[PDB]
């Protein structure tokens, strides 16, 4: 490629800037960067910040922000050689209003019981560039007292330390912070009234550390100041989440109406006045609830049993999830209630190694007299909430569980996106719930956690993703049944999905007598086999290995057009699209030359050196002639002429002088190649008098 030259970029600065390698502007202004490029063919330009991208030789950002600052890249490519890249660092600049805060420090003195008070005046401001701080008490401070930047701060903060605090120091101190007026940014000031009444905030709360309540109850909390100068600002907050709904803040008073169980949590009242540590009082609000009452049958452990056998230990545990967990109390009944007071032979244990906070009675030397219906009742002492119970019949019939997959739903295949339903079925007395997990990987579930409880033994997946395709485990719970090694069973999940073929579009060129073959290849797809391929031409079907091929015997006017191969797996369809013709490629205008020729500076005429190259001359039938059209933008009528080609090769520069052009005006130039097939791809350009 003799005349083809690789791209070359150069960034240029415009829009608003201020004051080498960097483009500094005030936040809120507008950025305007332009990428000038050269090389042939004329390269295209995208602005990016990664090296996302905007396809434009000029980058323009209105009302720029702090974060939009950074390094920007102009990328320019044309096919020939290595793409051109150029960088520029945009440094958006700003100066917010400074914050002024103060705290005291009392400290001992060597060999003395006298004490020295020290105040720290801390001035913080976020700014680009690094700010400049000046301190004043009406007058500028230099010396006796000290200025510095404290630790754990990168110059955004300066502190004025007043070591021994004598009355004359009690004045108004004012931090004035400047950005050097760079980018014409004003300085800003903040002042503080340091007085012997100045004091950090303090609060008193009308309720205890932790407050227990029932659902529905209205609860109101008064948070009142007990100290603070300046007058601090009191604020309530909640974790997790925000306060509302159903809760109103008078200010200081926080009331919660019709409290729901999910409203439980920490409510924090905090006072701030930029003096000392902000005061906070914290109350933990606990709404009562009881959920998920569960029992466990644990056969003799020491005899390593998994089954109810006479002459063995049988533990029957009991548990429920409650907010004031420590406050629950359990009652064990049996065909009516003995309240588990027997002890001898049958005994109560409330806290063994078993799960947390579980009442569990043991039966030593199990007897037929122990076969019965046992009930455990969890309750809160004199609480309005309802009690919860768990019945568990023990008899000869009670037996550990077994789990299986029904029929051959072991592997269940579905198409991506649809819903999937995995099923396990469990047998035993009692029948425990099933816990579904994934085994091929460690991912979560419908419930968003590693495992999911289910009693119907069904696991439903609404929007199934191919990523989810894998193996899944279903197993017996250790609760609401035997507490034994869970029984397990696996099911496979195939997530089929439609094909993806290549190329989506391809522009194919070839001479008039010659042949061409189009291939549509399948890259991804489950099933990964071409079930069928169907080729169409300009809308109509044609008659006809991982891919499909079609051969156009003779690329002619009758055969040239758009070909579509619709490849499909048993699940979906996807298509390649080919454009076949014997049209020559577009001419590529050459932009980098001094062009105009003044004809005797008279007749109001100049001439233009129109130059270009022919893209891929040997891709189709040889180029015979170019059709040249010239319009001057001002007259509708156009002068059409034909250039006859002498000879050409890839990259050869072509020329044609346009003879009669009004001396000031510009023109549109349309250049079309002609082969035996006819008109190739037309190209266009605007020419102008330069000098
Ligand atoms: C209802 O209550 C029962 C227990 O009373 C809950 O079963 C418990 O579920 C948790 C997981 O949520 C299990 O803890 C986990 O154990 C694995 C190891 O097995 C560990 O890797 C995890 O970090 C986590 O600690 C716990 O073992 C299990 N307890 C029993 C006795 O099986 C059940 O989840 C509750 N259901 C609901 C809907 O609240
Ligand atoms: C570049 O962006 C401007 C708007 O900022 C737009 O007017 C112009 O047409 C764009 N350039 C191109 C080549 O589209
Ligand atoms: C503080 O200063 C004021 C006058 O500025 C004075 O009335 C007061 O006694 C001083 N001492 C205290 C503890 O406020
Ligand atoms: C809380 O107040 C509302 C009316 O403001 C009332 O309907 C509700 O019953 C109150 N809460 C209780 C526990 O009574
Ligand atoms: C908060 O409520 C109490 C009475 O419940 C009242 O004395 C106090 O003024 C209230 N505070 C506000 C800011 O309304
Ligand atoms: C409220 O205080 C608790 C206890 O100190 C704390 O865990 C929680 O993060 C705090 N929440 C807020 C919003 O301050
Ligand atoms: C226990 O057995 C009784 C009668 O034998 C029955 O009414 C009750 O429903 C059974 N309980 C369970 C949990 O099966
Ligand atoms: C197919 O359609 C394209 C676009 O309309 C057209 O250029 C071509 O001549 C058509 N081919 C035939 C054989 O009609
Ligand atoms: C100047 O241009 C006009 C219009 O294009 C043409 O008629 C005329 O012959 C030209 N004169 C010369 C001296 O080239």
Author numbering: 19 to 37, 45 to 76, 86 to 176, 182 to 583, 589 to 735
Cite, word for word, the article reporting this structure.
Members of the presynaptic neurexin (NRX) and postsynaptic neuroligin (NL) transmembrane protein families form the axis of a signaling pathway that is crucial for the formation and function of excitatory and inhibitory synapses throughout the brain. MDGA proteins bind NLs and control their function and interaction with NRXs via unknown mechanisms. MDGA proteins are attached to the postsynaptic membrane via a C-terminal GPI anchor, and their large (∼900 amino acids) extracellular domain consists of six immunoglobulin-like domains (Ig1-6), a fibronectin type III-like (FnIII7) domain, and a memprin, A5, mu (MAM8) domain. The extracellular region of the NLs contains a cholinesterase-like domain that forms a stable interaction with the α/β-NRX1-3 LNS6 (laminin, NRX, sex-hormone-binding globulin) domain (Araç et al., 2007, Chen et al., 2008, Fabrichny et al., 2007).
Following an extensive screen of constructs from various species, we obtained diffraction-quality crystals and solved the structure of the complete chicken MDGA1 extracellular region (cMDGA1ECTO; Ig1-Mam8; Gln19-Lys919; 79.5% sequence identity and 88.4% sequence similarity with human MDGA1ECTO) using selenomethionine single-wavelength anomalous diffraction (Se-SAD) at 3.20 Å. cMDGA1ECTO was treated with endoglycosidase F1 (Endo F1) prior to crystallization, leaving a single N-linked N-acetylglucosamine monosaccharide on glycosylated Asn residues after enzymatic cleavage. Seven domains (Ig1-6 to FnIII7) could be unequivocally resolved in the electron density maps; however, the C-terminal MAM8 domain was not visible and most likely highly mobile and accommodated in the solvent channels of the crystal. The cMDGA1ECTO Ig1-6-FnIII7 domains form a surprisingly compact, folded structure that is ∼120 Å wide, ∼110 Å high, and ∼50 Å deep, fitting comfortably within the typical height of the synaptic cleft (∼20–25 nm). Finally, the Ig1-FnIII7 domain contacts (395 Å2 BSA) close the cMDGA1ECTO triangle and are formed between (1) the Ig1 N-terminal stretch (Gln19-Tyr22) and loop BC and (2) FnIII7 loops AA′ and C′E, and β strands βA and βB. The linear orientation of Ig1 and Ig2 is stabilized by a disulfide bond, distinct from the core Ig domain disulfide bonds, between Cys36 located on Ig1 loop AA′ and Cys222 located on Ig2 loop FG. In the crystal, two MDGA molecules form an unexpected intertwined dimeric arrangement with individual C-terminal ends pointing in opposite directions. Homophilic interfaces are formed between domain pairs Ig1-Ig5∗, Ig2-Ig2∗, and Ig6-FnIII7∗ (where ∗ denotes contributions from the second MDGA monomer); their combined BSA is 2,666 Å2, suggesting a stable association. The scattering data were unambiguously incompatible with a dimeric MDGA1 molecule but were instead accurately (χ2 = 1.17) modeled as a limited ensemble of monomeric conformers with pronounced flexibility at the FnIII7-Mam8 domain linkage.
